[PDB]
């Protein structure tokens, strides 16, 4: 019994109406009790999940009125009539027809104007080189939407191994995303090449945003 949620992320504006869907691979309706065994849970960062809706459409005590669940059989929906700041969370559907299985979750994010990444590239520090290591670091800061790709090139050739990547969550202040990418090699390897390039691909630019340093 597989639970499938879409979209995986959902850009919203405060105050507007939001809808997210859950589909089951098999019907969740108990004919014997005309009961659809499908619940909705909210999980904000760092917190434990919280039950919002059960039996597909019954609101848990205390849960505000702007949350409604609907649907039946294999197609279900969670609606937030007017979205508040306090509602940005991950929402999970969970079936309890046959065992208790969660869907993959839909994350609410704040929409805003598209922003191209600011790309910075940093040579290794003198103090790291004295240790024998050498990390080249690329920051892709304050972009929107969240999808982005980064490519490293050394002396004009694409490099894939040694690359470590990290992604922030949406920033609470300007609603943008950021990415860090670290290329780790030895001092000797680093001193063999001359040109280090970090190239970003993002929907705000028809060409890659490239930044580099020599030597």
């Amino acid at each position: 019994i597989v639970m499938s949620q879409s979209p995986s992320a959902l850009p919203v504006s405060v105050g507007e109406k939001v809808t997210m869907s859950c589909k089951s691979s098999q019907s969740l309706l108990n004919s014997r009790t005309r009961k659809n065994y499908l619940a909705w849970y909210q999980q904000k960062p760092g917190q434990s999940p919280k039950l919002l809706i059960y039996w597909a459409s019954t609101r848990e005590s205390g849960v505000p009125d702007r949350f409604t669940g609907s649907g039946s059989g294999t197609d279900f929906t969670l609606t937030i009539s007017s979205v508040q700041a306090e509602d940005l969370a991950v929402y999970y559907c969970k079936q309890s027809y046959n065992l208790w299985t969660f869907g993959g979750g839909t994350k609410l994010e704040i929409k805003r104007a598209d922003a191209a990444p600011t790309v910075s590239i940093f040579p290794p520090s003198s103090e790291q080189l004295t240790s024998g290591g050498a990390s080249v670091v690329c920051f892709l800061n304050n972009f929107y939407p969240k999808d982005i790709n980064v490519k490293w090139k050394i002396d004009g050739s694409e490099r894939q191994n040694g690359v470590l990547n990290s992604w922030t969550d949406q920033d609470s202040k300007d609603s943008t995303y950021s990415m860090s990418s670290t290329l780790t090699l030895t001092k000797d390897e680093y001193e063999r090449h001359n040109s280090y390039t970090c190239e970003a691909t993002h929907k705000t630019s028809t060409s890659p945003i490239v930044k580099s340093f020599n030597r």
């Binding site: 059960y54 969970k94 040579p123």
Partner: protein, 211 residues
């Protein structure tokens, strides 16, 4: 009704861990106790439950063999025992009570973090990130264990234009980077320093960013 779980766990591969979950405010044996796994950046995975009345446990296929649910009913405590740990076991584990009206997980514990690594406690190396209208600086905090490290800029005085990237665990050690953006007219004129702390190793490091 409250469910309180035990504290975070650090383990090497192969060992066992036992997590507890103490329940209060309700008749313990009237409701099932459930365990849910959540890997760091992933979703929720129901693991199974145990009937508190009769003590029989039920495991989903992925959790058969190595995992043990147990109870001490007189103390209203449920236990999760994970034997032969792997790195894929690194996750937060929640206990949660099952309410039969709805068949839902209505009250949850706060979660217990388990990290599996062959690393021993290791202090980080901290390195400045210097370039080459606005200028972006950074610090690289590399090769430490366990989490957390904390990073501030100018002893906390620098607030906006700062963000810190989530640590990633690669080859049993963590690495993270911080970023600060300041007006190009203010650096290197006004000094910028990253303050890094690693409590597990009592490490405190202040690193000035120089051009």
């Amino acid at each position: 009704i409250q469910l309180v779980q035990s504290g975070p766990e650090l383990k090497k591969p192969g060992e066992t861990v036992k997590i507890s979950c103490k329940a209060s405010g309700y008749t313990f044996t009237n409701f099932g106790m459930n365990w849910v796994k959540q890997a760091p950046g992933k979703g929720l995975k129901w693991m199974g439950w145990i009937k508190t009345y009769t003590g029989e446990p039920i495991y989903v296929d992925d959790f058969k063999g190595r995992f043990a649910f147990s109870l001490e009913t007189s103390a209203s405590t449920a236990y999760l025992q994970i034997n032969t740990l792997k790195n894929e076991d690194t996750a937060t584990y929640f206990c949660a009570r099952g309410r039969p009206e709805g068949y839902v997980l209505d009250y949850w514990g706060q979660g217990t973090s388990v990290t599996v690594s062959s690393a021993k406690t290791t202090p980080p190396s901290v390195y400045p990130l210097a370039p080459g209208s606005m200028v972006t600086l950074g610090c690289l905090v590399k090769g430490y264990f366990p989490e957390p490290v904390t990073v501030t800029w100018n002893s906390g005085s620098l607030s906006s234009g700062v963000h810190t990237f989530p640590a990633v665990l690669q080859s049993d050690l963590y690495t993270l980077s911080s970023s600060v953006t300041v007006p190009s007219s203010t650096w290197p004129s006004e000094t910028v320093t990253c303050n890094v702390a690693h409590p597990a190793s009592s490490t405190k490091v202040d690193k000035k960013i120089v051009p």
